[PDB]
Design a binder for this molecule. Structure first.
Ligand SMILES: [Zn+2]
Ligand SMILES: [Zn+2]
Ligand SMILES: [Zn+2]
Ligand SMILES: [Zn+2]
Ligand SMILES: [Zn+2]
Ligand SMILES: [Zn+2]
Ligand SMILES: [Zn+2]
Ligand SMILES: [Zn+2]
Ligand SMILES: [Zn+2]
Ligand SMILES: [Zn+2]
Ligand SMILES: [Zn+2]
Ligand SMILES: [Zn+2]
Ligand SMILES: [Zn+2]
Ligand SMILES: [Zn+2]
Ligand SMILES: [Zn+2]
Ligand SMILES: [Zn+2]
Ligand SMILES: [Zn+2]
Ligand SMILES: [Zn+2]
Ligand SMILES: [Zn+2]
Ligand SMILES: [Zn+2]
Ligand SMILES: [Zn+2]
Ligand SMILES: [Zn+2]
Ligand SMILES: [Zn+2]
Ligand SMILES: [Zn+2]
Ligand SMILES: [Zn+2]
Ligand SMILES: [Zn+2]
Ligand SMILES: [Zn+2]
Ligand SMILES: [Zn+2]
Ligand SMILES: [Zn+2]
Ligand SMILES: [Zn+2]
Ligand SMILES: [Zn+2]
Ligand SMILES: [Zn+2]
Ligand SMILES: [Zn+2]
Ligand SMILES: [Zn+2]
Ligand SMILES: [Zn+2]
Ligand SMILES: [Zn+2]
Ligand SMILES: [Zn+2]
Ligand SMILES: [Zn+2]
Ligand SMILES: [Zn+2]
Ligand SMILES: [Zn+2]
Lengths: 579, 579, 579
């Protein structure tokens, strides 16, 4: 068994036999980082890559071949310098890319990064995850105090040990199209980068590929976004999952979804807490105009959106539906907290269909619609609390329809004064606290609109179903000829009311005439009561059996309303026949 | 430390001291795979198993004991042959089963398979995962082109390196009852098998046990199903999870659920795209008739169902409720895509309760009910798109009730002509495009049916709740003697309308009589208005205080309807007492 | 390369060169457990800790430094004693805490426990998981019998090999505040503890920190709870996940949530099946009264709650909302099974808002409210089955509102007799089986209450929308001076009914007066019909154009009801102006 102190020492030692074992103490002698296990290949003439092939310098052929165990490659085993400070401005892009590429060659797995600042941009490859190292965690306080005191005793919190920068202004971690199952975890990404002291790196994570996963990742200081997801036509950009991530200050948005679907954030935060670093929005779902960009099926569970006021900044969480397959962005805010200035912005030009906000908290306005005229077409705003710590309104410049349901919410000091949403939305039970404007429950949903219009038939019946009263009403344009208008049923008593409703000035119809009928199974008696019947502008009526005919007297007096009340013992005899 | 080239060489070497380390270069000399680490046990008398115990041949005592690291056993470390072609018809079942059995013996973990074609059927054991090896991934294109071009530049996609076949026609991976927490990942399973060139292996994964997990697995070419789940009575078959799996062509169904509950598919596909290989259905939830089989609580999230036409094949995704505890299969299609000929089939003999289809896309009919008479009893068909690329209809041979809600959907050219579903379902707002049959919103739900019937009491009230109009109506069978019929309340004005509604021919009742009452807190005045009152067939009335009595004149004229209109300032005085 | 038999021997040997490799056969000589790899540091002056630093005794400098691979430290490599019996009363707390503390120092990972009983309490540290070792699994039965027989053939089930006890009566696993990302898996926790044979350990897992995860963990025999979650003010106690866990018998509750949010249980069970070991509740969500404790956002998916009767035990699953941010505890029971005596208890003093029980099974009462007067304010009780195996009732001592929806359930022999819930809740379609009390569907929801009250306007219209009948009603207190009361619209016929509804004795108003109006676009005709109009106690009316004025005749006769019927052709002319 061969044991040397560095890769340079390995290059001076030849293997005795095929696949002899060699073990390096470190990559660079005396650092304690980068040690690995190698197998001797006497015939190898591949190019020395400082990673998988270690060519012996004192021989014409021969190499020590890296053995990766447990599908984890430590980047230090390719020569990456560990535990560097941010002031060590060393481009290690080529080394890190070698690690990702080589793991992707041998079936995927994990590229482990050490602690330290690393300036090295990487192109993700399928089924490879880049993983950092948490800094040391040392708890504070005794078990007794932790158990007995309600105050905080264990004050130590975890800290990232890996700080991943880019070598230029583009991105740190690019996930190309058709790259699937890649990931990143357990590190912090920083916007400061090689090549410029004033202009930071554009993106932390830029996702074009599919099924990306990130856990315990923070992003801070990026020139555009910490996270940016935009696929391409014809290739999947979907099934992305983020948990325990903190997308912090960025000069445009903390994060942006531009072209993707089926994305989930769980226990992640989005925070613009550096007001001196001016920015644009907080969290932005914004497909680019006049492109095939589309975003839909996004779920944010137990996330925090938090913003402090900043010069020129709009503290909004934007949802922009564009060219989605169903017409809904299917974006759900569940168990989320909007803190500081954070608020939801409807950016849907063709209306926001099925907007979902449930069990969320709002420090200020729940909705702030910048574009006048945008509408939330439908949705459910349930079990939320508007704390009213800042602004006291429900929304700014927002429009909804009756298919937007507001139910189960806690309104602390929430005012709906002069807010048209209060006359548009459906309200169920809600709780009004402090000085909140109490809105009585009111149904404005489309599914129930037939119960709110005047119906086309009206009446009442006996609980025994042997007595019925039904009333219908028709508009009649009468001329001077008698016209059959209706036939009353048998076994019924009917009252017909005829009155004018004419739009003519002076010469319109004037009449209020009651006609009465009672019939058994074959025989009919009628009677009349002319309360008002102008001899020039009134109405003429005539019975032929059970068929009523009407006529006007003067053509200008032509518009009459005819209402029928039918009393019967069975529904079959409850309605007239209109002719 | 000893280092030999194979296990056979290890059998010829004794350890110098207790627990001396030995390293095999390969399992079989010169193959380059399966090498492992062993520890010397001078006292060991166990049987050589070619895996964990390597006995020195020719001695009563002495063995080299395998050292498994990180709960991962490479199957090659039991002699399994790697890198084989599909034409290498080599049964390795015994070797693979030894690895699974041994890992289950020492606490579970992973059995790692190499790249290549492997003919070896395995019985899963608890807490053991079988994992293959991805083939090498090498991306295409420069970072600049990937970032700058909207066209696809990175064209390389991941490929499986492990192709797992069976050694006979049964199944590749059997998960017995009471085997819990097993899994499979990162491989492709193929239906071609040893012993027959014409009859393929029945199943890829056959699951009888509990809490199974599969990720990044494809199934293709199986004689029955790529995936088949059927538990047994008294043992759990539940909590199964599948992600990033592709269940491809099979001669019966791509996958089938027969007896199990709480199963989730996320970002999986079900595809019958080999029409020349005839098949039965696309995806089948089908408990066997006349058994205890039952399937319920199934969620398909962001899945693709895709089928091309094939002779005798039905391109359906079938849901069959049978013996479920709640009467609902609780099957949800969320964010799914039905492509080609794919369509949902209701196969519930006792009705499909709470059918859920949300944010799904349909290339053709959404529903195709093969069995005439089957009903979708209730559910929500929300936020879906019917593209109408193939057939333009909503459904075939399908029946629903008013508790099936159709809302928020996008209907491109969808025709409901002659489709009874349009007269059965509840419709909310929907979007109708092209030549789609515009269905007005209409509520047919059971919960609201009381708003669509005629009420037993009717009227109107003031917004101040100090003025009421209430009307009730009754049928009376009168004889020649007076009978008490009602008592009007105090503090009210009342109008009683009495009219005939008799089924007798010629000799029935004829009357239209209006009675009026006004009372303060104690005093009552009455008045009458006989509009129609036949001297033989009319009605007689008499007041005793506030109690009205009625009588007929001739027995054949006996059926009268009595309607009361009550005007009052308080609800307590708003209704008569019917006697 | 040095290889010695124990750590003790390592302390007696100095390394020859920098970073020489040393390998111990065991930690303690001859045990077969705890061997590890060390690197020589000649300069080291750190303190010997029996784990990471092994100082050579008798020298001022020099130490062997532990090499941890793969982020897994085996506790045996710190001297932990493996495979001990429960009767081996050996405290290993100091060793286990060292392992957790050291892994948290070098970036987190896993502390692997061996098989056996271990008495050792541990304080969790961030991003560190404690993992046990399953006992051996050996399946039973042939593949043929497993595949061909519908009866259970594979009878072997997984067994824990690690049994984790406490060293005293407090807790086994404490997760302090600000400790994040810790976990436990693959072991069993037992309440028996060192120092007392009669008083067991209080808690198995006590969680104060954030983002805890447990999988395949059982807890049994604890004096208080197997699982207990209570955070502190100002620090997150959230995002906790449990899967495949069994919280068994405990002397108070199997598990309790006291101060936490966003907790998920999937495929877990909660079972009090040892009635001889008396207990308090089954599963308890209970913030302490008069504290800042609060619990919300809890999901239980496919869990089992199972209780046998025990003297003094209440077999309840309690939900207590207290000071939650939205007023709803947001607790969901999905796909769950309540077995034996298990039943849900509403323990919300302020009402249980948005109670969710869906696709659950109940062996007995679904709800048992111990505190008389507690209400379920709203919720959805959908797709559940009440088997009626024990008690036949739906609930005990429970109160709901109409915003509690009961729909899609299967009521087997469920009796609602004398249960006020049947008169309070909203009922949709439900299935009534056996001797069950059939409850008709009835809507009692607040959102639709405007369809059940008398409306403030009533009438009927034509399907062509060119004929309308609208009626309104008002209360008038008239004096002796004429008072303008209304103005009838143009282009309409109106019938005004005026009648008394006076509460005065003897001297109240008496009138039934009908007034009629017809107008075209400018001209108006009126008529009157005084059916009742007392000369002393009646009403006076006067028209000025379309404005009606009313006056009384005697001050004591002052209360009049005025009903207006408007007939029109246009909505603009369908209503009077009330003055
Ligand atoms: Zn390996
Ligand atoms: Zn490293
Ligand atoms: Zn730093
Ligand atoms: Zn540090
Ligand atoms: Zn910096
Ligand atoms: Zn997609
Ligand atoms: Zn699409
Ligand atoms: Zn929805
Ligand atoms: Zn509701
Ligand atoms: Zn409704
Ligand atoms: Zn005409
Ligand atoms: Zn006349
Ligand atoms: Zn006219
Ligand atoms: Zn090879
Ligand atoms: Zn290990
Ligand atoms: Zn192949
Ligand atoms: Zn291998
Ligand atoms: Zn290949
Ligand atoms: Zn089950
Ligand atoms: Zn799971
Ligand atoms: Zn996933
Ligand atoms: Zn059951
Ligand atoms: Zn449902
Ligand atoms: Zn709706
Ligand atoms: Zn009689
Ligand atoms: Zn008769
Ligand atoms: Zn008279
Ligand atoms: Zn490592
Ligand atoms: Zn161990
Ligand atoms: Zn034991
Ligand atoms: Zn054992
Ligand atoms: Zn929190
Ligand atoms: Zn989680
Ligand atoms: Zn808050
Ligand atoms: Zn809800
Ligand atoms: Zn419903
Ligand atoms: Zn019975
Ligand atoms: Zn006055
Ligand atoms: Zn008069
Ligand atoms: Zn009075």
């Amino acid at each position: 068994s061969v044991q040397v102190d560095s890769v340079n020492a390995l290059r001076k030692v030849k293997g005795l036999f095929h696949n002899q074992k060699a073990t390096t103490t470190s990559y660079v002698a005396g650092t304690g980082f980068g040690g690995a296990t190698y197998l001797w290949d006497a015939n190898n003439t591949a190019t020395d890559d400082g990673l998988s092939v270690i060519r012996v310098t004192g021989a014409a052929t021969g190499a020590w071949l890296l053995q990766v165990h447990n599908k984890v490659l430590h980047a230090t085993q390719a020569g990456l310098r560990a535990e560097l400070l941010e002031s060590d401005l060393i481009d290690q892009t080529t080394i890190l890319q070698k690690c990702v590429d080589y793991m992707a060659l041998i079936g995927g797995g994990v590229v482990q990064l050490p602690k330290g600042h690393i300036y090295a941009k990487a192109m993700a490859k399928s089924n490879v995850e880049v993983r950092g190292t948490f800094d040391s965690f040392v708890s504070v306080g005794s078990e007794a105090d932790i158990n007995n005191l309600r105050t905080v005793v264990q004050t130590a919190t975890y800290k990232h040990g890996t700080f991943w920068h880019s070598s230029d202004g583009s991105q740190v971690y690019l996930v190309p199209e058709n790259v699937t199952g890649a990931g990143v975890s357990n590190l912090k990404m920083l916007g400061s980068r090689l090549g410029s002291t004033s202009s930071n790196c554009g993106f932390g994570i830029k996702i074009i590929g599919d099924s990306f996963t990130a856990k315990w990742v923070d992003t801070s200081g990026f020139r555009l976004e910490g996270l940016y997801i935009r696929g391409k036509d014809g290739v999947s950009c979907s099934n992305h999952y983020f948990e325990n991530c903190n997308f912090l200050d960025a000069r445009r948005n903390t994060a942006a979804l531009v072209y993707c679907h089926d994305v989930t954030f769980k226990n992640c935060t989005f925070q613009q807490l550096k007001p001196e670093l001016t920015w644009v929005y907080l969290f932005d779902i914004e497909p680019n105009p006049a492109t095939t960009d589309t975003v839909y099926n996004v779920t944010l569970i137990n996330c925090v959106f938090n913003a402090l006021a900043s010069a020129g900044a709009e503290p909004t969480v934007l949802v922009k539906e564009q060219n989605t397959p169903t017409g809904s962005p299917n974006v759900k805010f569940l168990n989320c907290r909007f803190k500081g200035k954070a608020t939801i912005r409807n950016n849907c030009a063709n209306g926001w269909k099925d907007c979902i906000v449930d069990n969320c908290e709002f420090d200020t306005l729940a909705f702030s619609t910048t574009t006048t005229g945008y509408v939330i077409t439908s949705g459910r705003f349930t079990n939320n609390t508007l704390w009213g710590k800042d602004l006291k309104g429900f929304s700014y410049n927002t429009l909804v329809t009756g298919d937007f349901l507001i139910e189960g919410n806690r309104f602390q000091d929430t005012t709906f004064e002069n807010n048209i949403v209060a006359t548009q939305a459906s309200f169920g039970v809600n709780t009004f606290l402090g000085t909140a404007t109490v809105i009585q429950p009111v149904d404005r949903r489309t599914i129930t609109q037939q119960y709110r219009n005047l119906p086309d038939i009206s009446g009442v019946k006996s609980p025994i179903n042997d007595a019925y009263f039904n009333t219908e009403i028709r508009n009649f344009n009468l001329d001077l000829n008698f016209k059959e208008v209706l036939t009353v049923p048998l076994r019924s008593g009917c009252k017909i009311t005829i009155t004018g409703a004419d739009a003519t000035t002076n010469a319109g119809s004037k009449a209020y005439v009651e006609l009465f009928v009672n019939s058994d199974n074959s025989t009919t008696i009628t009677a009349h009561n002319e309360v008002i019947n102008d001899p020039l502008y009134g109405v003429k009526y005539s019975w032929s059996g059970r068929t009523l005919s009407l006529a006007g007297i003067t053509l200008s007096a032509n518009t009459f309303i005819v209402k029928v009340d039918v009393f019967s013992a069975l529904p079959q005899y409850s309605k007239v026949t209109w002719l």
